[PDB]
């Protein structure tokens, strides 16, 4: 039984200290081990100050938002 958002599905970030808070990014993969605290891996078009466009988030920090659309983060 798959857990978390599907691969390639857009999710809105709910981590307040994240550089992409309330932004959206494609789900690269979700780790299926229940022991992993932050299994969801999300990649973004906008890099942060460390020039990193991907990060691993918790299961409770992604809400499966729709596609961004024209001129929308």
């Amino acid at each position: 039984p798959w857990v978390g958002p599907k691969k390639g599905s857009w999710v809105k970030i709910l981590r307040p200290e994240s550089y992409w808070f309330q932004q959206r990014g494609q789900v690269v993969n979700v780790n299926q081990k229940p022991e992993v605290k932050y299994p969801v891996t999300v990649k973004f078009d906008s890099v942060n100050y460390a020039n990193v466009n991907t990060n691993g988030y918790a299961l409770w920090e992604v809400i499966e938002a729709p596609a961004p659309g024209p001129g929308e983060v």
Partner: protein, 131 residues
Amino acid sequence: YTETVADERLFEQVYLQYTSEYLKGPLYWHPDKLQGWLPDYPGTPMIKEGKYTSHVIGNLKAFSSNELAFLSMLFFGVGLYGNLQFNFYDPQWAKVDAGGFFNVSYIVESFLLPISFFMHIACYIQRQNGK
């Protein structure tokens, strides 16, 4: 059984939900729970049900809505009369300039306009609570 991160998060949620309810009770005694701090004064609840309780208007809490409405309109009339009869009609400036004295009735009445404003506010607050 091993404690997965989901189980730890579940314990976090249970602990927070229980403790946030417990600390509101009479068994936590934090300085932020003193009188003059966040909680309302014991016998004088200000806001309940998202409506100004009758205790907001202080000593007027026992007044009826009709009494407050009558006082509000009467004070509005008297204070507006005083202001208009002191500023524009029957000016007192020339009379007091030549050594005279103010018409004390005008001065006393003119202070009843903001009193009337707050009186009609209190009338509405009383009407909301059904008093």
